[PDB]
């Protein structure tokens, strides 16, 4: 596929709660904004695996793997640009498209490690 992505991020949190946020579709319209996703499968706290329509045409996954006191959560993606001629295609920057979706993955993957990690707020119980 022209773009292909197979990143991971340590998330310091329980697999229950990393799968939850991943799963979250008001979340996926933030963090991919151009394309709408499909889910093929849950698969609890392991993940989840999507279909991808719009700006791209492919496949999409997490896989969250146990490390440490957290998960390390596996993003993937197999896409085509879709519906592009191949005129279009040929002119196309192919790494610098991946590399635009590889950040976009690992902003999705740091938001869900920022908020699952976060200390416990300021006057507010329990105080500790």
């Not at 799968?19 to 151009?34: E, G, Q």
Request: hydrophobic share 45%; aromatic share 8%; net charge positive.
């Amino acid at each position: 596929n022209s773009i292909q992505i197979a990143d991971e991020t340590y998330v310091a949190a329980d697999a229950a709660r990393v799968s939850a946020a991943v799963a979250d579709r008001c979340s996926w319209r933030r963090w991919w904004p151009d394309l709408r996703l499909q889910v093929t499968e849950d698969r609890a706290d392991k993940g989840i695996r999507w279909t991808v329509t719009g700006a791209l045409t492919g496949t999409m996954e997490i896989w969250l793997e146990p490390s440490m006191d957290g998960v390390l959560l596996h993003y993937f993606l197999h896409a085509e640009p879709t519906g592009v001629a191949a005129w279009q295609l040929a002119r196309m920057n192919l790494a610098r498209m991946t590399h635009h979706r590889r950040v976009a993955g690992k902003k999705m993957a740091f938001e869900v490690k920022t908020v699952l990690e976060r200390s416990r707020p300021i006057g507010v119980s329990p105080v500790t």
